[PDB]
C-alpha cells in the first residue's frame, strides 16, 4: 500500500553516522565534502557528502528516500542520508553519493577547452552525453518525477564517462516560457530545460543567450526568439533541440521521443 511503500523506502535511506568519515571541502546554502563509507562487506567506499542547514526535515528524508529508491544508470544513485545536530540546535542533513572524480558536466566541458584539461571532446561523445541525459530523464518522467532544475551543472560524469542526472540543490535562462509566466511546470518544462542543456553541451559550456540579460528574458522568448544554432552543430541536432522550445508544451516531444531521435542521430555518425 502507499504507506507501506513509503515506509519501506524510509527504512533503508538512513546511514549510521559511524559508518562515515568526512574529508576535505570540495565546494562551499551548503557544502560538498569528500568522504568514506563503510559498506556491509567490510570495505570502505569513496563518497561525496552534501551538508545543509522538523517538518522540513521529514521532507528532506522522504524525498531522499524516494530518490534512493529510483534505480537507473543515468540517474545518480543516492546511497543514503545522515542527520547531524549543530551546537545551536540546528539539524545538519547530509546526503551521501558515490564520489565521481570527473565532477559535473558543465565544469568538464569548460576544462576540455584548456590544454591541460580533458582532451577536446568529439561530436560523437558530445551527443552521447545528450543520449545519457535523455535516458535518465526518460526514466524519471515515466515516473512523473519533475526535475525542475535541469542544466549541465547538475549532470555528473561517472568514471566510465557515463552521464547521470542529479541535482546539487544549492536560472531564468533554463526555464520554459510558460513557467516564466504561469509558474505551471510539467515534464514538458523539463523538456525545455533539456533543450537548453543540449545547447550548453554543444557550445562546450557557454552561458545561454549571450547578449541577453536575465530581466529581458521572458520578453525575448515572448517574441519567438530562441537560442541560436552553435557553429559545427549538426542541423539535425539543432532541430532536435529547437523542438524542445516549441511555444506549446503539448507540441514538444517527450523524453522517450527525444532519446530515440538522439540515439538515431548518433548511430548515423561515421
Ligand atoms: N565529485 C562529486 N562526486 C559526486 C557528487 C558530487 O557532488 C554532488 C552532486 C550531486 C548531489 N546530489 C544530491 O545531493 C541530490 C539530493 N536530492 C536529490 C537529487 C536528485 C534530484 C533530481 C534527480 F533527477 C536526481 C537526483 C540529488 O542529486 C550531491 C553532491 F554532493 C561531487 Cl562534487
Ligand atoms: Cl577499505
Ligand atoms: Cl564513479
Ligand atoms: Cl543564443
Ligand atoms: Cl532565433
Author numbering: 568 to 595, 598 to 622, 628 to 744, 763 to 862
From the article:
MERTK is a member of the TAM (TYRO3, AXL, and MERTK) receptor tyrosine kinase family. Myeloid epithelial reproductive proto-oncogene tyrosine kinase (MERTK) plays an essential role in modulating cancer immune tolerance by regulating macrophage efferocytosis. MERTK is activated by autophosphorylation when protein S or growth arrest-specific 6 (GAS6) ligands that bind to phosphatidylserine (PtdSer) are exposed on the surface of dying or dead cells bind to MERTK. Therefore, the active/inactive state of kinases can be determined by DFG and αC conformation: the active conformation of kinases should adopt the “DFG flip-in” and “αC swing-in” conformation; all other conformations in DFG and αC are inactive kinases.
Previously, a thermal shift assay using purified MERTK kinase domains in an in-house kinase-inhibitor library revealed that 8 of 356 compounds exhibited a melting temperature shift of >1 °C15. Among them, BMS794833 (IUPAC name; N-[4-(2-amino-3-chloropyridin-4-yl)oxy-3-fluorophenyl]-5-(4-fluorophenyl)-4-oxo-1H-pyridine-3-carboxamide; Fig. 1a), which is currently being studied in phase I clinical trial as a treatment for advanced solid tumors, was co-crystallized with the MERTK kinase domain. The X-ray crystal structure was determined at a resolution of 2.16 Å. The clear electron density map for BMS794833 showed that it occupied both the ATP-binding pocket and the allosteric back pocket (also called the hydrophobic patch). BMS794833 formed two H bonds with the ATP-binding site and two H bonds with the allosteric back pocket of MERTK. The amine and imine at the 3-chloropyridin of BMS794833 formed H bonds with the main chain of Met674 of the ATP-binding site. Two oxygens in the 4-oxo-1,4-dihydropyridine-3-carboxamide group of BMS794833 formed H bonds with the side chain of Lys619 and the main chain amine of Asp741. Specifically, 3-chloropyridine-2-amine interacts with Ala617, 1-fluoro-2-methoxybenzene interacts with Leu671 (gatekeeper) and Phe742, and fluorobenzene interacts with Ile650, Asp741, and Phe719. No salt bridge was formed between Lys619 at the β3 strand and Glu637 at the αC, which is essential for the active conformation, and the αC-helix extended outward from the ATP-binding site. BMS794833 is a typical type II inhibitor with a DFG-out and αC-out conformation, with a similar binding mode to MERTK as LDC1267 but similar to merestinib in its chemical structure.
